Amino acid sequence: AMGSMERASLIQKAKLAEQAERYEDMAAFMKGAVEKGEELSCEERNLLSVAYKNVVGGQRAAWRVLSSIEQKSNEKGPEVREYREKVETELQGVCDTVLGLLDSHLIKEAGDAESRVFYLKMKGDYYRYLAEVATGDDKKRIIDSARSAYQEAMDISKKEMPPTNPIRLGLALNFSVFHYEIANSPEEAISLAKTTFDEAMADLHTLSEDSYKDSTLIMQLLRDNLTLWT
Amino acid sequence: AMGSMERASLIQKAKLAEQAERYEDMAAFMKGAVEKGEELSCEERNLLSVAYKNVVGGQRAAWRVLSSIEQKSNEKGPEVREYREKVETELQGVCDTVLGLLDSHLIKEAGDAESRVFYLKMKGDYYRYLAEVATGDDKKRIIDSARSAYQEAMDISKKEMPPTNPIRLGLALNFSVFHYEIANSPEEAISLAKTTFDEAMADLHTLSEDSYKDSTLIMQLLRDNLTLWT
Amino acid sequence: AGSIPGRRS
Amino acid sequence: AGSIPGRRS
Ligand SMILES: *Cc1ccc([N+](=O)[O-])c(O)c1
Ligand SMILES: *Cc1ccc([N+](=O)[O-])c(O)c1
Ligand SMILES: [Cl-]
Numbered sequence: 169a170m171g172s173m174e175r176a177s178l179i180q181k182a183k184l185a186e187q188a189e190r191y192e193d194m195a196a197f198m199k200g201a202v203e204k205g206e207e208l209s210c211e212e213r214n215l216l217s218v219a220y221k222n223v224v225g226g227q228r229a230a231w232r233v234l235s236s237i238e239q240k241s242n243e244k245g246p247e248v249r250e251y252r253e254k255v256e257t258e259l260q261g262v263c264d265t266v267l268g269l270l271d272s273h274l275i276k277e278a279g280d281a282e283s284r285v286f287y288l289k290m291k292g293d294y295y296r297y298l299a300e301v302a303t304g305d306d307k308k309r310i311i312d313s314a315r316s317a318y319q320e321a322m323d324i325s326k327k328e329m330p331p332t333n334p335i336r337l338g339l340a341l342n343f344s345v346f347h348y349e350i351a352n353s354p355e356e357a358i359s360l361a362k363t364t365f366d367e368a369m370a371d372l373h374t375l376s377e378d379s380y381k382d383s384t385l386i387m388q389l390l391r392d393n394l395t396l397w398t
Numbered sequence: 399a400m401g402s403m404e405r406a407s408l409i410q411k412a413k414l415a416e417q418a419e420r421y422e423d424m425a426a427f428m429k430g431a432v433e434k435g436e437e438l439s440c441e442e443r444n445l446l447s448v449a450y451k452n453v454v455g456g457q458r459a460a461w462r463v464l465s466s467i468e469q470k471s472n473e474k475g476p477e478v479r480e481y482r483e484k485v486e487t488e489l490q491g492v493c494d495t496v497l498g499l500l501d502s503h504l505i506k507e508a509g510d511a512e513s514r515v516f517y518l519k520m521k522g523d524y525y526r527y528l529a530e531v532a533t534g535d536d537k538k539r540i541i542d543s544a545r546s547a548y549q550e551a552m553d554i555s556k557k558e559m560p561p562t563n564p565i566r567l568g569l570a571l572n573f574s575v576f577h578y579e580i581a582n583s584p585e586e587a588i589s590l591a592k593t594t595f596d597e598a599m600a601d602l603h604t605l606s607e608d609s610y611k612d613s614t615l616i617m618q619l620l621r622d623n624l625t626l627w628t
Numbered sequence: 629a630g631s632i633p634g635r636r637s
Numbered sequence: 638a639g640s641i642p643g644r645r646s
């Protein structure tokens with residue numbers, strides 16, 4: 169529905185939608201901007217990510233509420249299951265949409281480390297969200313798709329980015345959550361978080377005051393998880 | 399889209415949607431329940447009201463953000479106006495839907511004071527929301543439609559309900575907000591809030607502990623407004 | 629100026 | 638266990 173709107177107008181309205189906390193609109197505007205076919209700037213990538221993180225975040229929270237009610241019930245009839253299935257299907261649709269944008273054609277055109285790692289982190293995240301609700305023949309393949317995207321992103325970020333780079337840190341944080349919550353590998357999650365934190369600590373001395381704030385913010389999230397896991 | 403679902407299943411899913419904070423779903427389920435054509439119970443009326451209050455509340459908050467940005471701009475292009483108009487149109491559509499449910503045929507079948515006052519209060523509220531964004535030939539007629547619904551509700555509640563009845567109190571609260579914010583009648587708003595509060599105070603002695611809590615809760619909201627207005 | 633919140637059943 | 642919040646640009 170966005171094909172008739174200018175790319176720059178879509179970006180401007182995505183920013184307005186964020187201010188209005190209209191994240192479904194924000195996502196539709198950024199989907200339209202992606203489909204114009206041009207690569208995305210750093211700021212534009214953030215807008216895309218923020219929009220869909222909010223949309224799917226609301227869906228995941230609702231799914232967890234309903235899944236919990238459904239587990240307690242296991243006679244109220246089919247309603248809790250039916251409605252959990254409806255939310256689940258809508259969530260899977262959003263994840264498929266984001267993954268489709270990455271595959272057509274954001275990732276293949278992303279040549280710089282900053283953009284390619286960003287998109288591969290996204291790919292890992294949205295397969296992780298699919299894995300959270302998966303139960304059928306493809307649960308293992310979904311998990312391996314998340315793992316593979318995260319791993320490629322990790323390999324690039326370790327080669328091409330300093331240990332304090334916020335995207336590198338956020339990727340490691342989320343990959344560690346993947347290990348702990350999805351892959352049943354809590355020791356791998358703990359080891360990754362610790363090594364990521366320690367390598368960043370040792371590189372903080374190179375940073376400006378503003379970069380220091382950006383990096384230590386995410387380092388605290390790694391620490392919070394380690395405190396919860398150990 | 400709800401014609402094929404049982405009335406009781408729609409009500410059950412509206413309750414689930416509230417727990418999941420999926421208020422657009424909740425509203426659609428309760429719209430489906432209304433369209434089954436049977437009158438609504440006290441609890442069912444509350445579910446209908448809660449659902450649409452949340453939906454339109456989100457739209458009103460977004461409209462105010464965008465309207466404020468638009469007023470500051472008055473060159474960024476037509477985008478802020480266009481997007482404010484889009485939100486405004488969606489808000490008006492929701493208000494029209496609720497008003498359509500009240501007119502077809504909730505109000506005409508509502509014979510008890512509790513149900514009729516409840517629906518007429520709703521009618522006043524959703525015309526008030528239309529009035530908040532109105533600027534054209536019909537702004538005055540929209541305002542008078544809100545006033546007329548509130549007034550009929552007030553006349554019934556004063557005849558048929560005790561001064562501490564929570565619906566009577568909430569109606570008076572919202573009618574006073576109408577006077578202050580929409581009708582440019584701050585003295586009428588203050589007088590209504592004061593008289594409502596004082597008449598309720600004098601009737602609290604008749605109430606149980608639980609009814610006392612229900613009534614004093616809304617009385618505090620009247621007091622909060624009076625503190626802001628005087 | 630606050631109307632009825634009315635957002636929780 | 639917290640992932641990146643990532644909900645504010
Ligand atoms: C994935 C990611 C990494 C870092 C930050 N940050 O705030 O620096 C995000 O918002 C997201
Ligand atoms: C309109 C209205 C009146 C009273 C209450 N209450 O909480 O007692 C509402 O939620 C809504
Ligand atoms: Cl359903």
Ligand SMILES: [Cl-]
Pocket residue numbers: 181480481484
């Ligand atoms: Cl628009």
